[PDB]
């Protein structure tokens, strides 16, 4: 603790060690893997129970009817970002008779985290979101790091055992991008990707959670009998 | 950072007591003697100045006796500079009461208000307090003459005679062994002087290092008269009692 | 330390301050809660530490409203703040919509309150530099999910539970909860099952001056069972250990 | 200023709370015993000190309401703030709600003052534990509560706080039975005098007794009055020791 | 109503030879109803005399307002305030509530203790120094008073000649005035001695 | 140890923290020489242009405050921009509320006060720059007042600042012994510039090019900088002498 | 040590906390700036970390005003907040004076903001260098902005790993044209020195981005280089370095 | 956030307050100043010493005017004096020139500035001023008076005193040289003779700043025909005036 319990100092290697440390909060959380083609985006989250009499924790939050965010880190830290993303999405509908886009929303959120990490008595947040949505420009899937880094991909993952998921996605790359207009196949390819984020824990209907939005599809969260389809 | 540089001096030690309240008592012992004795015709406050010097003017000085209001004045033991902030709060406070209820302030409210102010400064903020102890000579019509000492964290406790300041333990003992409840102002003047004389921090007790103030009910119309003596009237009584 | 922050990290990736809070639910008095679809039974160890303590006006059962109950375990100075906020939230919902508040929604509000440590993160008012140190067992009955029982941590995270035990004896208590619970249980077999699990982690003897039952039912509201009934149930449990 | 002065401790403690319980051990001792027709709070008055005019000394038992009394232990500097705050509360409840305060109403308020500065940053809590006793209006059920620096409160039938509180509590187990309290005002009064003459000592001077009765009646019983009761206690004690010496000789 | 025609009031003041005099009536009304034939509108802090006219409430409101400020000066600087220094004080104080003001006409009268000179001064509601060494009259029959006091006045008056001019001037305005009369009291203010003497007059 | 880390008095009655500001102007290698004329105030200063890829005409150390008072900054350039903004504002403020432009003396006192509050505040770092204000007023004449981060100022007949300012101080001191006056006498403003340049070439021993000087001349009721075109006339004209 | 805050200072004229923050930019991406007669040509190397990534779909060039491209290297989230800050200051200038903000003027405003965090204990300074310029009625300009809130005029700038390599090539290019070159022509030279400065990142692979504000072509507004024009620039650099 | 709202002045364990002693160290390593009270004026006097040989010293006022009748002079630090001389002037105008439209008593003024000092040892963002002041003055209600403000924010009245690094020599010098009455002429000759052994060089009138708060001057009044308004009791002495008094030794 010369720079290690201090959210205001630099940090002899151009870092802050607290941003590296907030990234272990994602490790201690579960895993979610997202993939998009061009006509659908998909989040597939692994939910986590606290014991067999304990329910499972929902890891997909609906933000809009064309937007949803998923967490794979701390839940009270995911409650800040969720509130904020929802406020700016409704604003867009009310004032400009517009829909909000993921790209733009990644930048509003970037700046929000930055200015709390600038402050002393602040923190770099203990969560990472993947934010999908289908807007005016098509699908977007952005990956939000505790650093705030937004990058636009066709497939990404966050959580534990994410490196193995990204191996899945580097193979299936041109398969999934060229399925367009058949929502079924994309969703089944995110189940198997996240089967390479397992330790052989298997997937049950109450561990597997899908939520999708297409061009012609709402943001809808699938669970129960509506995820047994896609296995 | 900003937390790095934090005092943390307004918290307790494992004793369940603040670091700052204890520090303040040491410095109130550095400060010159101030004593109160309560006669049945008044209250004698007698203060010895902390400093004395060759070219120092102690003849326009009233550096230990201060009028808070007309019937309540104080003797000061501690830091002089510190005592002055609390002095002008007490003046406001007294007038505010006189302002609203059209009646002179009881002593009881006046002591307590100053106790609170010291208490806030030890409570929160990392702030230092005002380490001062006041000896209040006051009159009220609901309990006669009333006498009080106050402590650095703001607490008041009743007395019939008390001493705070330099060589407090030695002084306070001479006051206990002599005290009678039937004492008048004339006796009380002489006792106070003799006690100051046996605990002087020079080699004598002289008018130029003495301040003397009394509150008399023997005054015109049977009313309370606050009289803060000139150094030549302090010189006059000193020669009567035979120290000089 | 990495708790001398207000939201600092902590090489592990989690707070320090949160971890300590969770070991101050081990300063609690065991609160056990069995949720069934015929009601939710809450039993609590009141704790009697003196025979000079008035222990029958001590309960760890607290009424949020008629259709929502809560049982608290841990450090109970923290808990006064959390239960007050929940009472208003429930009452606010019936103001704006004239409606019965979700047990799920209510639990979520009290989690929103729990995150308040920081002095520079987010975009809300901060009146804590530290987290809470107490966990809740929110039961209730809503018309969309039926009977529910939720366990809220002072972290700001919550799970719906079929059965949970928190307190000092939480580890051994939950160990029995896993084996004996089934979904064929009803309001009364659940009710004597609580008193069995509590009995091991009881440190005096099971009696009506250290133990209090309460249910929450749809058709009666929140009813805290009178000592005569609480005493009866304690005796008919022991008669099924006399039946072994 | 928003820098924490109360933090979660690594023991699952608060630092300030261990310190605050220790400020209450070092202070004054208030013993609380409730009758069947009264409550009685006797507190140790400092008047060990020589040369003290006691008319002007602030009492250590302060009435908040016409039928609710407040006593305290710990730092005396810190205590005035609770008493000052409580008086405003009593009158605020009459103003806006009708009726004087209840005992229950003040029990949660005082607990909330101590709690707030515990949890909050940039504030430490007081070193003060209090006894709130009295009656509720249009009731005649004796209420005896204790509030503590943590922000916690509990009911009691008899209690004691402050210095050599352990010694007092141990006496009170065999002499105060939860089932039958003392049924008369004098025996309730006298039980608190017997506890106080253990630790406080030195006549009735340093001993105080406040009695509150149903329907708004607070009376303060002076040192003088208390002396009468000592003399009866001394003959009762002395005589009971004599008849134990005679049985022991035979047996 | 008017805030300045609701209980009347006049204060007269004159200078003499090594002396001043101030005097008021005793009539305190609430509109047309007479309430009392007793009420001083004259007050004194040390050797300075404040007559305050106008509005009922503002007589008291300004009187304890200057009660506070007089204290501060005496306790700090250990002397009683001078007539001239008081006049400045009053000027600045009246001006503080510029909009919606103090509803009064104070009149300042003393004899200095540093040079031994008479000093008088006047003010409106907003307040502006109206210096004289003649006479300062204020109130509602202030108009009446201005003519009557002139007719009588002679520069320099023996303290009981002084007493003849002010008694007469005050009583005559005040028994043609609706909100004022009902008794009168004249102070003859000498350097070291004040006599407060009431006047018998029309109580009607 | 905190009397070298924030601003509290050491047992020696000092603030090393204050000191550390004066040692920072000396890492940027800029020297200045400022002389009062007879109809002007001249200030000449180093510019460093070490790359082709730096623009020379943009780079500046002479910042124009008032239309009478120029400001020459010796030491780190972030703190320069902050002080120029604050000094212009204050001169403008005075023009706005008093109806004449701030005198030099008084601009020096306003920044001096501000510099003393930043060394009183422990969550605020003072300015690290040494500011010379030069002017020709008709309230005071030719003027030099040099404020410093300590909060101290005095007027001057002349001054130099920079790491090597002890050599410039020797040349200037001798020049007022011989003349027998506290300012240079000459009736052309151009020539007062040239004497100043001579004394700088002598002091440091280095001859200047047109893109290593930036020259400010305050004449009567205007302050201007000479462009690199005009500086070259002056540097040929020193040989002619 | 003297890095505990920034109201500490060492006798050295250095402060340590501020020096550390330039070390973050020094592992950044190559970003260059070429000052031309008509304008300015910005170009920035965008690292392709994976094949999951979409090339030319995230930009590091975010427009400020209508005619100042701003492009940054160092800490990407931090730099995006600093650029966000100077868009609020640009809208305030257009509302207030009814004219687009001058480049020297916009440069001044940014300097102040970043200056401030090195005065107050309670905020964390910026760790980016920004490369910005455009064309206004003061002419074409180019400015580079340190983490220390310093700017000067520039006829060549670079920042990133390959800041050494880039500068060395820009010097031979001002000796090639000591009377300056077109902004259209500087498209082809912008790519070239990125290729040369991608031999400090030849552990990785890159995507080429170029943007311009030129008086000669786009009527003085900052627009992007893309399509066939970008690919001439790709081809120019390619044939020379091979 | 701010957190600098804790005090930078605090108590030491074995009494006193350490921070105000450190500030006074700056006074006994400062410049030296002294004040002799006459029965017909006060002289206050100080040494000027240059930072460069090309510096001026008639562009610096080490003795400054607060109001026409009350002047002030420092020992200690310069910077600290610059800011504090302005706060004193400002408080002398808000509190007696909006409220009584005259110049305040000298006893009162000294008190008011001591409050500013006292509340500068309080809270963060402020640690005390590195000066002790002499506030020499005349009012008409307490006559002539002399004070010394300490960085404590305490004051003491004096009959003649000195502050600065020759304080210790100086008050001992004044013990023989001062007497119960003094003429003003002769008070000037005492004050220079004291400051003569406390300067290590120049002693001309262009190096010694001398000001008297002697008697009223109807030529520095700037208006006439009002005989109730007295001329300024302060008069700064120009160099030629001081040179004469040099020859009178």
Q: What is the CATH number of the domain that holds G147?
A: 3.60.20.10
Residue C48 makes CB contacts below 8 A (sequence gap 6+) with C55, C204, C209, C210
Contact assessment for residue B146 and residue D52, using Cβ atoms and an 8 Å cutoff: no
User: Distance (Å, rounded) from C-alpha D113 to C-alpha G132?
Assistant: 56
For chain E, strand residue ranges (E) read 10-15, 20-25, 28-30, 33-36, 42-45, 48-54, 104-111, 118-122, 135-139, 184-189, 194-199
Encoding tokens for residue F218? 């305050």
Rounded to whole angstroms, what are the CA distances from A95 to A90, D66, E71, H163?
9, 60, 62, 70
Q: Which of G4, B5, H21 is nearest to F10 (CA)?
A: H21
Select from B27, B56, B80 the Cβ nearest to the Cβ of H15: B27
Residue D29 makes CB contacts below 8 A (sequence gap 6+) with D43, D44, D73, D160, D161, D162, D163, D164, D165, D168, D196, D199, D200
G159 is catalytic: no
Contact assessment for residue D3 and residue B126, using Cβ atoms and an 8 Å cutoff: yes
Count the Cβ atoms, other than its own, within 10 Å of residue C201.
Answer: 19
- DSSP class of residue H223 equals -
Sign of CA dihedral F112, F117, F120, F122: negative
Domains and CATH numbers, chain E: 1-204 (3.60.20.10)
Tally C-beta pairs within 8 A across B and E: 20
User: Distance (Å, rounded) from C-alpha B3 to C-alpha F13?
Assistant: 26
Q: Which of E193, E184, E154 is nearest to E11 (CA)?
A: E184
Q: How many Å is the maximal CA-CA distance in chain A?
A: 55
Mutation target vs G (from F3, F8, F53; most G CBs, 10 A cutoff): F53
**Burial (CB count within 10 angstroms: exposed 0-12, middle 13-18, buried 19+), residue F3:** middle
Rounded to whole angstroms, what are the CA distances from D210 to C35, D104, F41?
50, 20, 88
User: Distance (Å, rounded) from C-alpha D242 to C-alpha C135?
Assistant: 58
Q: Which of F60, F163, F145, F166 is nearest to F103 (CA)?
A: F145
Q: Is G97 helix (H, G, I), strand (E, B) or coil?
A: helix
Encoding tokens for residue C31? 């609160």
Q: Does the residue G163 lie in any domain?
A: yes
Select from G112, G155, G170 the Cβ nearest to the Cβ of F81: G112
User: Distance (Å, rounded) from C-alpha C76 to C-alpha C25?
Assistant: 10
Residue found by looking up tokens 């998921």 in the block: A165
Q: Which of F128, F111, F146 is nearest to F41 (CA)?
A: F146
Crossing angle (nearest 10°) for helices E56-77 and H106-118 = 90
Contact A110 G27 (CB under 8 A): no
On whether any CB of chain B is under 8 Å from the CB of D152, the answer is no
- DSSP class of residue A225 equals G
Contact assessment for residue H125 and residue F123, using Cβ atoms and an 8 Å cutoff: yes
A19-36 burial: b if 16+ Cβ within 10 Å, else e: bebbbbbbeebbbbbbbb
Q: How many domains is chain G partitioned into structurally?
A: 1
Contact C52 D156 (CB under 8 A): yes
Q: Which residue of C has its CA nearest to D3?
A: C129
Contact assessment for residue A183 and residue A212, using Cβ atoms and an 8 Å cutoff: yes
- DSSP class of residue H231 equals P
Mutation target vs A (from G17, G52, G116; most A CBs, 10 A cutoff): G52
C68-74 and D30-34 strand pairing: unpaired
> Domain range spanning residue H170?
1-249
**Burial (CB count within 10 angstroms: exposed 0-12, middle 13-18, buried 19+), residue H203:** middle
Q: How many Å is the maximal CA-CA distance in chain E?
A: 47
Alpha helices in E41-180 (DSSP H): 56-77, 83-96, 142-152, 162-174
Contact assessment for residue G189 and residue G172, using Cβ atoms and an 8 Å cutoff: no
Q: How many domains is chain H partitioned into structurally?
A: 1
Select from C4, C21, C127 the Cβ nearest to the Cβ of D120: C127
> Domain range spanning residue G175?
6-242
Q: Which residue of A has its CA nearest to B2?
A: A120
User: Distance (Å, rounded) from C-alpha A125 to C-alpha A19?
Assistant: 8
On whether any CB of chain B is under 8 Å from the CB of E79, the answer is no
Contact B125 D122 (CB under 8 A): yes
Task: Quickly list DSSP for chain C.
Answer: --SSSSS---TTSS-SHHHHHHTSSTTS--EEEEEEBTEEEEEEE-----SSB--TT--SEEEEETTEEEEEEE-HHHHHHHHHHHHHHHHHHHHHHSSPPPHHHHHHHHHHHH--B-SSSSSS---BSS---EEEEEEEEETTTEEEEEEE-TTS-EEEBSEEEESTTHHHHHHHHHHH--SS--HHHHHHHHHHHHHHT-SS---TTSEEEEEEETTTEEE---HHHHHHHHHHHHTSSS--
Chain H residues lying within 8 Å of E77, measured CB to CB: 105, 107-108, 141-142
Q: Which residue of A has its CA nearest to C160?
A: A55
Residue found by looking up tokens 């109403």 in the block: D105
Chain G residues lying within 8 Å of B1, measured CB to CB: 4-5, 121-122
Q: What is the resolution of this structure in A?
A: 5.4
Residues of G with CB under 8 A from a CB of H: 121-122
Contact assessment for residue H210 and residue H34, using Cβ atoms and an 8 Å cutoff: no
Contact assessment for residue H153 and residue H38, using Cβ atoms and an 8 Å cutoff: no
β-bridge mates for residue H35, sequence order: H44, H161
Interface of F with G in 61-80 (CB under 8 A): 76-79
Encoding tokens for residue G42? 């910005």
Residue G159 makes CB contacts below 8 A (sequence gap 6+) with G25, G28, G31, G73, G74, G129, G131, G144
Contact assessment for residue E127 and residue E94, using Cβ atoms and an 8 Å cutoff: yes
Tally C-beta pairs within 8 A across C and D: 102
Domains and CATH numbers, chain B: 1-244 (3.60.20.10)
On whether any CB of chain G is under 8 Å from the CB of H3, the answer is yes
Type and span of the H or E element at G92: helix G76-97
Encoding tokens for residue D128? 């003060």
Q: How many Å is the maximal CA-CA distance in chain H?
A: 63
Type and span of the H or E element at F73: strand F69-74
Q: Is H127 helix (H, G, I), strand (E, B) or coil?
A: coil
| Backbone phi, psi, residue D178, to 5° | -65, -25
β-bridge mates for residue A134, sequence order: A139
Alpha helices in chain D (DSSP H): 15-25, 76-97, 103-119, 165-175, 185-199, 223-250
Tally C-beta pairs within 8 A across F and G: 87
Length of chain H equals 249
Question: Chain-centre distance of CA E109, in angstroms?
Answer: 7
Contact assessment for residue E88 and residue H100, using Cβ atoms and an 8 Å cutoff: yes
Residue E143 makes CB contacts below 8 A (sequence gap 6+) with none
Encoding tokens for residue F123? 């969550």
Encoding tokens for residue H49? 């010493």
Question: What distance in Å separates residue G73's CA from the closest CA in chain B?
Answer: 27
CATH number at residue H207: 3.60.20.10
- Give the gyration radius of chain G's Cα atoms: 18
Q: How many Å is the maximal CA-CA distance in chain B?
A: 66
Select from H99, H140, H142 the Cβ nearest to the Cβ of E92: H99
Decide: H and B in contact? Rule: 3+ Cβ pairs under 8 Å. Answer: yes
Sign of CA dihedral A132, A133, A137, A138: positive
Encoding tokens for residue A138? 């098509």
Q: Which residue of E has its CA nearest to B91?
A: E72
Rounded to whole angstroms, what are the CA distances from C146 to A8, C190, F164?
49, 17, 86
User: Distance (Å, rounded) from C-alpha H247 to C-alpha H249?
Assistant: 5
User: Distance (Å, rounded) from C-alpha F90 to C-alpha F138?
Assistant: 20
Question: What distance in Å separates residue E80's CA from the closest CA in chain B?
Answer: 13
User: Distance (Å, rounded) from C-alpha B12 to C-alpha D124?
Assistant: 8
Decide: E and D in contact? Rule: 3+ Cβ pairs under 8 Å. Answer: no
| Backbone phi, psi, residue D43, to 5° | -145, 150
Q: Is D69 helix (H, G, I), strand (E, B) or coil?
A: strand
User: Distance (Å, rounded) from C-alpha F182 to C-alpha C242?
Assistant: 116
Contact assessment for residue C166 and residue A50, using Cβ atoms and an 8 Å cutoff: no
Q: Which of E134, E194, E202, E204 is nearest to E171 (CA)?
A: E202
Q: Is G55 helix (H, G, I), strand (E, B) or coil?
A: coil
Alpha helices in chain F (DSSP H): 16-19, 77-98, 104-118, 165-179, 189-204, 228-240
Count the Cβ atoms, other than its own, within 10 Å of residue G104.
Answer: 15
- DSSP class of residue A24 equals H
Helix/strand/coil (H/E/C) assignment for every residue in chain B: CCHHHCCCCCCECCCCCEHHHHHHHHHHCCCCCEEEEECCCEEEEEEECCCCCCCECCCCCCCCEEEEECCEEEEEEECHHHHHHHHHHHHHHHHHHHHHHCCCCCHHHHHHHHHHHHHHHHHCCCCCCCCEEEEEEEEECCCEEEEEEECCCCCEEECCEEEECCCHHHHHHHHHHHCCCCCCHHHHHHHHHHHHHCCCCCCCCCHHHEEEEEEECCCHHHCCEEEECCHHHHHHHHHHCCCC
Q: Does the residue G1 lie in any domain?
A: no
Resolved by: cryo-EM
Q: Which of B123, B157, B145 is nearest to B42 (CA)?
A: B145
Q: What angle do CA C194, C197, C201 make, to 5 degrees?
A: 125
User: Distance (Å, rounded) from C-alpha B26 to C-alpha B40?
Assistant: 33
Interface of B with A in 189-228 (CB under 8 A): none
**Burial (CB count within 10 angstroms: exposed 0-12, middle 13-18, buried 19+), residue B182:** exposed
F62-64 and F69-74 strand pairing: antiparallel
Rounded to whole angstroms, what are the CA distances from E189 to B228, E115, E148, E159?
29, 16, 21, 8
Task: Find out whether the peptide bond into A134 is cis, omega within 30 degrees of 0.
Answer: no
H144-149 and H155-157 strand pairing: antiparallel
Q: Is H16 helix (H, G, I), strand (E, B) or coil?
A: coil
Residue found by looking up tokens 């352990």 in the block: D166
On whether any CB of chain B is under 8 Å from the CB of E176, the answer is no
B42-48 and B210-216 strand pairing: antiparallel
């Amino acid at each position: 603790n010369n720079y290690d319990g201090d959210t205001v100092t630099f940090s002899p290697t151009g870092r802050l060690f607290q941003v590296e440390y907030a990234l272990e909060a994602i490790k201690q959380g579960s895993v979610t893997v997202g993939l998009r083609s061009n006509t659908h985006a998909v989040l597939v989250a692994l939910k986590r129970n606290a014991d067999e009499l304990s329910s499972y924790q929902k890891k997909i939050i609906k933000c809009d009817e064309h937007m949803g965010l998923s967490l794979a880190g701390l839940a009270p830290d995911a409650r800040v970002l969720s509130n904020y993303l929802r406020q700016q999405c409704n604003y867009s509908s009310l004032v400009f008779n517009r829909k909000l886009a993921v790209e733009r929303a990644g930048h509003l959120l970037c700046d929000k985290a930055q200015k709390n990490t600038q402050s002393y008595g602040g923190r770099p947040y203990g969560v990472g979101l993947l934010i999908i949505g289908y807007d005016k420009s098509g699908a977007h899937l952005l990956e939000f790091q505790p650093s705030g880094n937004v990058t636009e991909l066709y497939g990404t993952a966050i959580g534990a055992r994410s490196q193995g998921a990204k191996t899945y996605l580097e193979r299936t790359l041109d398969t999934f991008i060229k399925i367009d207009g058949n929502p079924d196949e994309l969703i089944k390819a995110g189940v198997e990707a996240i089967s390479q984020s397992l330790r052989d824990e298997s997937l049950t209907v109450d561990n597997l959670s899908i939520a999708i939005v297409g061009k012609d599809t709402p943001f809808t969260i699938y669970d129960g009998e509506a995820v047994a389809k896609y296995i | 950072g900003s937390r790095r540089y934090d005092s943390r001096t307004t918290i307790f030690s494992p004793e369940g007591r603040l670091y700052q309240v204890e520090y303040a008592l040491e410095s109130i012992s550095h400060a010159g003697t101030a004593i109160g004795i309560m006669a049945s015709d008044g209250i004698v406050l007698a203060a010895e100045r902390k400093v004395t010097s060759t070219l120092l003017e102690q003849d326009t000085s009233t550096e230990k006796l201060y009028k808070l209001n007309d019937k309540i004045a104080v003797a000061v033991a501690g830091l002089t500079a510190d005592a002055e902030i609390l002095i002008n709060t007490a003046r406001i406070h007294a007038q505010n009461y006189l302002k609203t209820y059209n009646e002179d302030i009881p002593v009881e409210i006046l002591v307590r208000r100053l106790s609170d102010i010291k208490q806030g400064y030890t409570q929160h903020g990392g702030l230092r307090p005002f380490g001062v102890s006041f000896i209040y000579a006051g009159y009220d019509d609901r309990y006669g003459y009333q006498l009080y000492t106050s402590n650095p964290s703001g607490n008041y406790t009743g007395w019939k005679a008390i001493s705070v300041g330099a060589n407090t333990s030695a002084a306070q003992t001479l006051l206990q062994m002599d005290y009678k409840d039937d004492m008048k102002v004339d006796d009380a003047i002489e006792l106070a002087l003799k006690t100051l004389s046996k605990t002087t921090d020079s080699s004598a007790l002289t008018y130029d290092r003495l301040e003397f103030a009394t509150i008399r009910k023997g005054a015109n119309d049977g009313e309370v008269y606050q009289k803060i003596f000139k150094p030549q009237e302090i010189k006059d009584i000193l020669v009567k009692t035979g120290i000089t | 330390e990495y708790d001398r922050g207000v939201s600092t990290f902590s090489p592990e990736g989690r707070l320090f301050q949160v971890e300590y809070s969770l070991e101050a639910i081990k300063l609690g008095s065991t609160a056990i809660g069995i949720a069934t679809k015929e009601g939710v039974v809450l039993g609590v160890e009141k704790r009697a530490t003196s025979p000079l303590l008035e222990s029958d006006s001590i309960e760890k059962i607290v009424e949020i409203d008629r259709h929502i109950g809560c049982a608290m375990s841990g450090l109970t100075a923290d808990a006064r703040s959390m239960i007050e906020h929940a009472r208003t939230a429930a009452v606010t919902h019936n103001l704006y919509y004239d409606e019965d508040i979700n047990v799920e929604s209510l639990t979520q509000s009290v989690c929103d309150l729990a995150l308040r440590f920081g002095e520079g993160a987010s975009g809300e008012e901060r009146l804590m530099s530290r987290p809470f140190g107490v966990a809740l067992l929110i039961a209730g009955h809503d018309a969309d999910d039926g009977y529910q029982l939720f366990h809220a941590e002072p972290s700001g995270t919550f799970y719906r539970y079929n059965a949970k035990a928190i307190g000092s004896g939480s580890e051994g208590a939950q160990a029995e909860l896993l084996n004996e619970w089934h979904s064929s249980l009803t309001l009364k077999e659940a009710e004597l099952l609580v008193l069995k699990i509590l009995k091991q982690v009881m440190e005096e003897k099971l009696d009506e001056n250290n133990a209090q039952l309460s249910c929450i039912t749809k058709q009666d509201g929140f009813k805290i069972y009178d000592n005569e009934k609480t005493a009866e149930l304690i005796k008919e449990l022991k008669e099924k250990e006399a039946a072994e | 200023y928003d820098r924490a002065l109360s933090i979660f401790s690594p023991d699952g403690h608060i630092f300030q709370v261990e310190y605050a319980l220790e400020a209450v051990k070092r202070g004054t001792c208030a013993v609380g015993v409730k009758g069947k027709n009264c409550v009685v709070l006797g507190c140790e008055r400092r008047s060990t000190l020589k040369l003290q005019d006691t008319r002007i000394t602030p009492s250590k038992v302060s009435k908040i309401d016409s039928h609710v009394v407040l006593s305290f232990s710990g730092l005396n500097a810190d205590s005035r703030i609770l008493i000052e705050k409580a008086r405003v509360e009593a009158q605020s409840h009459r103003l806006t709600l009708e009726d004087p305060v209840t005992v229950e109403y003040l029990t949660r308020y005082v607990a909330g003052v101590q709690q707030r500065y515990t949890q909050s940053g940039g504030v430490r809590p007081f070193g003060v534990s209090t006894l709130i006793a009295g009656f509720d209006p249009r009731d005649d059920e004796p209420k005896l509560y204790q509030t503590e620096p943590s922000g916690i409160y509990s009911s009691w039938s008899a209690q004691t706080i402050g210095r050599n509180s352990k010694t007092v509590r141990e006496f009170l187990e065999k002499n105060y039975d939860r089932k039958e309290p003392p049924a008369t005002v004098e025996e309730c009064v006298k039980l608190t005098v017997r506890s106080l003459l253990e630790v406080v000592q030195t006549g009735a001077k340093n001993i105080e007794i406040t009695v509150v009765k149903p329907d708004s009646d607070i009376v303060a019983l002076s040192s003088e009055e208390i002396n009468q009761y000592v003399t009866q206690i001394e003959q009762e004690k002395q005589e009971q020791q004599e008849q134990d010496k005679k049985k022991k000789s035979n047996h | 109503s008017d805030p300045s025609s609701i209980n009347g009031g006049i204060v007269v003041a004159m200078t003499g030879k090594d002396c001043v005099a101030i005097a008021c009536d005793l009539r305190l009304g609430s509109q047309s109803l007479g309430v009392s034939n007793k009420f001083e509108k004259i007050f004194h802090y040390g050797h300075v005399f404040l007559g305050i006219t106008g509005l009922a409430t503002d007589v008291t409101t300004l009187n304890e307002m200057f009660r506070y400020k007089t204290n501060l000066y005496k306790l700090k600087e250990e002397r009683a305030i001078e007539p001239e220094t008081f006049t400045q004080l009053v000027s600045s104080s009246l001006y503080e509530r510029r909009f919606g003001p103090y509803f009064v006409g104070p009149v300042v009268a003393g004899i200095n203790s540093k040079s031994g000179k008479p000093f008088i001064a006047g003010f409106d509601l907003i307040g502006c120094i109206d210096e004289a060494k003649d006479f300062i009259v204020s109130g509602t029959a202030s108009d009446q008073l201005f003519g009557m006091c002139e007719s009588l006045y002679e520069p320099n008056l023996e303290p009981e000649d002084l007493f003849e001019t002010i008694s007469q001037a005050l009583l005559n305005a005040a028994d043609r005035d609706a909100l004022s009369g009902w008794g009168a009291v004249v102070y003859i203010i000498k350097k070291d001695e004040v006599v407060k003497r009431y006047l018998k007059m029309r109580q009607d | 140890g905190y009397d070298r880390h924030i601003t509290i008095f050491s047992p020696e009655g000092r603030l090393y923290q204050v000191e550390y500001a004066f040692k920072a102007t000396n890492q940027t290698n800029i020297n200045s020489l400022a002389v009062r004329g007879k109809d002007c105030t001249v200030v000449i200063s180093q510019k460093k242009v070490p790359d082709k890829l730096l623009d020379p005409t943009t780079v500046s150390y002479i910042f124009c405050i008032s239309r009478t008072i120029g400001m020459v900054v010796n030491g780190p350039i972030p703190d320069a921009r902050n002080a120029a903004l604050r000094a212009k504002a204050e001169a403008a403020e005075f023009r706005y509320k008093y109806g004449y432009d701030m005198p030099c003396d008084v601009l020096a006192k306003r920044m001096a006060n501000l510099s003393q509050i930043y060394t009183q505040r422990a969550y605020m770092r003072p300015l690290g720059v040494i500011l010379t204000f030069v002017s020709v007023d008709e309230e005071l004449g030719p003027s030099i007042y040099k404020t410093d981060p300590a909060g101290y100022y005095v007027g001057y007949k002349a001054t130099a600042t920079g790491p090597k300012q002890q050599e410039i101080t020797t040349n200037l001191e001798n020049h007022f012994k011989k003349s027998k006056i506290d300012h240079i006498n000459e009736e052309s403003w151009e020539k007062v510039v040239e004497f100043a340049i001579t004394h700088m070439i002598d002091a440091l021993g280095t001859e200047f090019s047109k893109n290593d000087l930036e020259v400010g001349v305050a004449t009567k009721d205007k302050f201007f900088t000479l462009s690199a075109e005009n500086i070259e006339e002056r540097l040929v004209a020193i040989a002619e002498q | 040590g003297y890095d505990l805050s920034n109201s500490v200072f060492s006798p050295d004229g250095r402060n340590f906390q501020v020096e550390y923050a330039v070390k973050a930019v020094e592992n950044g991406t190559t970003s260059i700036g070429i000052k031309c007669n008509d304008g300015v040509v910005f170009a920035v190397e965008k690292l392709i970390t994976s094949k999951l990534l979409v090339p030319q779909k995230n930009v590091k060039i975010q427009v400020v005003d209508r005619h100042i491209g701003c492009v940054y290297s160092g800490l990407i989230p931090d730099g995006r907040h600093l650029v966000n800050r100077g868009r609020e200051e640009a809208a305030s200038f257009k509302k207030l004076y009814k004219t687009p903000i001058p480049i020297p003027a916009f440069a001044d405003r940014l300097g102040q903001y970043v200056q401030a965090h090195t005065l107050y204990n309670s905020v964390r300074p910026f760790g980016v260098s920004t490369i910005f310029g455009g064309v206004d009625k003061n002419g074409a300009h180019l400015y580079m902005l340190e983490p220390s809130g310093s700017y000067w005029g520039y006829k060549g700038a670079a920042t990133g790993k390959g800041r050494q390599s880039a500068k060395a090539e820009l010097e031979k290019l001002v000796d090639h044209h000591p009377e300056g070159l077109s902004a259209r022509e500087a498209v082809k030279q912008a790519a070239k020195i990125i290729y040369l400065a991608h031999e400090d990142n030849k552990e990785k692979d890159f995507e080429l981005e170029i943007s311009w504000c030129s008086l000669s072509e786009t009527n003085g507004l900052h627009k992007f280089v893309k399509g066939d024009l970008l690919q001439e620039a790709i081809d120019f650099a390619q044939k020379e370095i091979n | 956030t701010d957190r600098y709202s804790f005090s930078l002045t605090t108590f030491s364990p074995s009494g006193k307050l350490g921070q105000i002693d450190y500030a006074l160290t700056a006074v006994k390593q400062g410049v030296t100043s002294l004040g002799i009270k006459a029965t017909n004026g006060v002289v206050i006097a100080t040494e000027k010493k240059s930072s460069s040989p090309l510096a001026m010293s008639e562009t610096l006022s080490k003795v400054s005017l607060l109001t026409p009748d009350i002047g002030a002079v420092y020992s200690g630090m310069g910077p600290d004096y610059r800011v504090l001389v302005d706060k004193s002037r400002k408080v002398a105008h808000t509190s007696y020139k909006r409220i009584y439209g005259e110049y305040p008593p000298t006893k009162l003024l000294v008190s008011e500035v001591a409050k500013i000092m006292q509340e500068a040892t309080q809270s963060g963002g402020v640690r005390p001023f590195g000066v002790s002041l002499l506030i020499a003055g005349h009012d008409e209600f307490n006559g002539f008076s002399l004070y010394q403000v300490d960085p404590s924010g305490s004051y003491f009245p004096w009959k003649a005193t000195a502050i600065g690094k020759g304080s210790v020599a100086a008050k001992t010098f004044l013990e023989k040289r001062w007497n119960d009455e003094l003429e003003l002429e002769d008070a000037i000759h005492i004050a220079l003779l004291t400051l003569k052994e406390s300067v290590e060089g120049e002693f001309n009138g262009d190096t010694i700043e001398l000001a008297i708060i002697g008697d009223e001057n109807p030529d520095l009044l700037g208006y006439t025909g009002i005989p109730t308004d007295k001329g300024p009791r302060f008069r700064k002495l120009t160099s030629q005036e001081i040179n004469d008094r040099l020859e009178a030794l």
